[PDB]
Amino acid sequence: APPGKPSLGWGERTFAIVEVNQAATAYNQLVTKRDSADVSVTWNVWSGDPADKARVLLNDKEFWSGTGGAAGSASFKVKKGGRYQMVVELCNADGCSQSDATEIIVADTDGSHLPPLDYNMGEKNKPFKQTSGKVVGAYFVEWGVYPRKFPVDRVPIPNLTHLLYGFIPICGGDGINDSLKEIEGSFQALQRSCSGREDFKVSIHDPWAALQKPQKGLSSWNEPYKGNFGQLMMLKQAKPDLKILPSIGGWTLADPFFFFTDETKRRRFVASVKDFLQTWKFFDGVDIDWEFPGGKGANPNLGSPKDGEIYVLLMKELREMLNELSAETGRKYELTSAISAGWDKIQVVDYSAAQKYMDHIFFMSYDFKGAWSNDTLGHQASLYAPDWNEKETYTTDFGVQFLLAQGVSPKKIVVGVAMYGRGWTGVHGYKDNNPFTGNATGPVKGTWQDGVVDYREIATEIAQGKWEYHYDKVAQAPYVFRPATGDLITYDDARSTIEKGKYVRANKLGGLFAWEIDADNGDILNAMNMGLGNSA
Ligand SMILES: Cc1cccn2c(=O)c3cc(C(=O)NCc4cccnc4)c(N)[n+](C[C@H]4CCCO4)c3nc12
Ligand SMILES: *[C@@H]1O[C@H](CO)[C@@H](O)[C@H](O)[C@H]1NC(C)=O
């Protein structure tokens, strides 16, 4: 004669270890990290013999015990997220009885409550297997879910080992993040994101795109995590070994790095990163995109020769931080950084000193030339120098050799590929039918910006005969040219991308990475995988 079978009371069935306010605009009002969720359950007895023991089991394992054998309740902590079958069990001296199972969702930022990502193999992407052991990385931009319409589910995830999230901002007002002011709405949007947040703490630039914007599979208005971050959790469920790293900085967010002479602000930043990864568990480490140590970044007023020493100090403490984060969670975290490929920036830092803490170096072998100059035309990401200027120092090969001369192990170096074109208009005064020898009247009309074109657009317009295509065989670089108007764009295509893969294998380098994933029609990432030796 066991107790009567209990019946569970109607109540909340979704609980969050990490709470997310779906309508907040300040970061500290947006998320609240906790070590566990507080799950509650009620039940009704009908036989009314105050049984000696009640229990609450989730997937047949005990999470709580108490003596509520007369229509009672229970609260208890659940520290690991997921979908749980909840059952209430009552016992007397004769035996036990168990209520019907109801499902509860204990959400956490590792995606343990979500199904795998339903990703698209769209356009010209074709599937590969990561067999080479080489790094195949790409940047996913936070603002890509707006007119670009490139959510995380568009990322061809079997063709990557690393996905970099650009960007995670460091918070500060006038004097700390003035590079943002050259983009309308951005500086103020960062101020809104950090209303009441300590300066030099990490944050989220766009909380709407990151966590609140409805996306594929994450639209129900009580979904704890939506936006890019929620999809990234489902990405982790799809390919658990794909590394997802937050990219702190970029071109317009690197200014707060220069104030890290003050160790007080460096400890605050490093500590905020630890709390950031505990809060957002789907990230597998940290990518530091200080652009650049010593200066010559977006802001012409910061930079110092001392920055090289502090760049190593930052890597040291971040690594120690990740090591004690490993001691808590048992996971392996990665420390990477996107660094300049120009020698005048490399020499600012002794990378042989920083490399002991770093897993990979994301060598930005692009942006060598651009529409920021009407006179200095050239290849933006070529492998070698062109014959018309053999002593060109801003090449992939020259940068790699300069970095190797510092004593950097070849395995840590990951070569950059440009999924975009930088270009000019009105190129005139050129000789030898070489448009690079002339000058420009301004930037080329671009996809989302003056002087920047998506490769997808370059490829489409080439098929439609709108461009006169050329390949610099010596420098290993393609470029399109319209003679009637002076339009000239330099970029990476499948041929030059394959040549970068050969170069990485011939020199025992780490692999390839590309900016940005939403600017590719599939051809570039295809060539990255083929050029590195992966199986199709
Ligand atoms: C003025 C300028 C002069 C010299 C170099 N420059 C750059 O090397 C540069 C790079 C970037 C960039 O983001 N590269 C991708 C990227 C990927 C991963 C991590 N970090 C960065 C950039 N946005 N701008 C400024 C905007 C203004 C108009 C178009 O380029 C840049 N400007 C300049
Ligand atoms: C390029 O030339 C145009 C017109 O000659 C000028 O207005 C513009 O400021 C120039 N840009 C640079 C970066 O020199």
Ligand SMILES: *[C@@H]1O[C@H](CO)[C@@H](O)[C@H](O)[C@H]1NC(C)=O
């Ligand atoms: C481009 O501008 C530079 C700057 O003075 C000048 O020296 C050079 O001759 C110009 N080239 C042409 C083809 O006009």
